[PDB]
Structure 1
Amino acid sequence: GEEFRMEKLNQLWEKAQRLHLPPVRLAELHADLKIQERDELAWKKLKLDGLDEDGEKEARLIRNLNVILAKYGLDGKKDARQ
C-alpha cells in the first residue's frame, strides 16, 4: 500500500520528501517516479509472470531510474555506512 509497492521506489520517495522537494518539483519527481512505477510494477509483474528472464526490462527501467536520479540530481550511494 505504500505510495508504490516497490521498495526501490518507496525508498527513493521517502528520500525525496527527505530532501523536501516542493509539490511542483515533487510532482515532477513523484509523477515520473510513478510513471517509472507503472513500468517498474509492470516489471515486478514481468519477472513474476516470466516475461524477462534476464531482467533487462528491469535494466532499461533501472537505467530509467538511474537517469531519473541523474535528472533531478538526487543519486549518491555512499549513504548508511560512513
Structure 2
Amino acid sequence: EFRMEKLNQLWEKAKRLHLSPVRLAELHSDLKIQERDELNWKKLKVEGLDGDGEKEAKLVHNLNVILARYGL
C-alpha cells in the first residue's frame, strides 16, 4: 500500500489503534507528503549530493510531531 517499510508499519499500527477515520486519513496525507520528502532525502543520501544533510532533520522532527499530534 505505501512505499517505505516504516509507513506501512505505521499504517497497520494506526489501524490497530482504531483511530477516527478523519484523524487516520490525515495521518496518510502527512506520511504520503513525507514519502516524496524521504525519496529525495534517500536519493541525495546514497549519491552523497546532500553535503549538509539538511533534508534529514525536517523529516525526523515532522515524523516525531506526527506521532505526538495524532495519538500514537
Q: TM-score if structure 1 supplies the norm length? A: 0.69
Query: Which structure features the higher share of helix residues?
Result: 2
Q: Which runs of 5+ in 1 are unaligned?
A: 75-82
**Which string of whole-angstrom CA distances, capped at 9 and with x for unpartnered residues, describes residues 48-67 of structure 1?**
33232564412220111001
- Provide the alpha-carbon RMSD of the alignment: 1.9
The count of corresponding residues between Structure 1 and Structure 2 is: 72
Greater RCO (CA < 8 Å, at least 6 residues apart): 2
Structure 1 moving runs of 4+ over 6 Å:
none
Q: TM-score if structure 2 supplies the norm length? A: 0.76
**Which string of whole-angstrom CA distances, capped at 9 and with x for unpartnered residues, describes residues 12-59 of structure 1?**
122111112233221111111111111112222221332325644122
User: What percentage of residue pairs aligned between the two structures are identical?
Assistant: 85
